[PDB]
Amino acid sequence: LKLRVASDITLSPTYPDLVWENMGAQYGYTLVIDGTSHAVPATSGEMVRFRVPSLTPGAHSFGVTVTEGGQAVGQTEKGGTIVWLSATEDKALVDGVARVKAASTGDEFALGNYLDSKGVTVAAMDAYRKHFASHKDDNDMRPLLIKTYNDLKLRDLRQKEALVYNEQLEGNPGFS
């Protein structure tokens, strides 16, 4: 019940989703962004995912309270910072994504890597997950997915991904 969240994350109207660690299906969450409280349903999925409704462009502080039966049971110790993109920045991000998709057709890694470079860590995570789902053996790039999970503080996912990486190292002829 030591929930942590990303220290810094970029979101935008095109990529509005925030993610944090699922503390257990018994728990709901209250996501607080600059004093506005959002009631987040409990989930049994691999992570908690919440579409942030439109914020004003710029920096916003957020924290998360863990709740059980509507009662606070835990809380982020340090919050994080959301940077919400302006209309102009979001148009550029959207054009960059389009450029990368045109130039590297079907390449989910290239897409994830571009989004990652702009701080759009949840969208980078989605693209990377697609990449590794179809190129499970691309171990050299896997640390970027590991780092993404680590940045979002998705502890279990990070541990699992690290185990995949190690098992793939260990599969090398002669290694173990």
Author numbering: 136 to 311
What wording appears in the published article?
Magnetotactic bacteria (MTB) are a heterogeneous group of aquatic microorganisms that share the ability to orient themselves along geomagnetic field lines. Previously in the alphaproteobacterium Magnetospirillum gryphiswaldense, the MtxA protein (MGR_0208), which is in or attached to the magnetosome membrane, was identified by a comparative genomic study as “MTB-specific. Because of its co-localization with putative signal transduction proteins within the same operon, mtxA was suggested to play a role in magnetotaxis. The MtxA protein probably has an importance in periplasmic or extracellular interactions that could act as a sensor or mediating interaction with other proteins or even activating signals in the bacteria.
The proteolysis with trypsin yielded a smaller and stable domain that generated crystals of excellent quality, which diffracted to 2 Å resolution. Furthermore, the residues seen in the electron density maps are L136-S311 (L142-Q313, MtxAΔ1−141). The overall structure of MtxAΔ1−141 has two distinguished domain architectures: I- Ig-like fold (MtxA-Big) in orange, and II- TPR fold (MtxA-TPR) in green. The first domain—MtxA-Big: L142-L226 (MtxA142−226)—has a common Ig-like fold consisting of seven β-strands forming two antiparallel β-sheets, which pack against each other forming a β-sandwich. The second domain, MtxA-TPR S227-N313 (MtxA227−313), contains five anti-parallel α-helices-and-turn motifs folded as tetra-trico-peptide repeat (TPR) motifs. MtxA-Big and MtxA-TPR contact each other extensively in a parallel orientation with a buried surface of 558 Å2. The MtxAΔ1−141 structure displays two protein monomers in the asymmetric unit. The two monomers tightly contact each other with a buried surface area of 418 Å2. The hydrophobic patch that covers the whole face created by the TPR and the Ig-like domains may indicate for an interface for interacting with other proteins, since TPR and Ig-like folds are known to be part of protein-protein interactions.
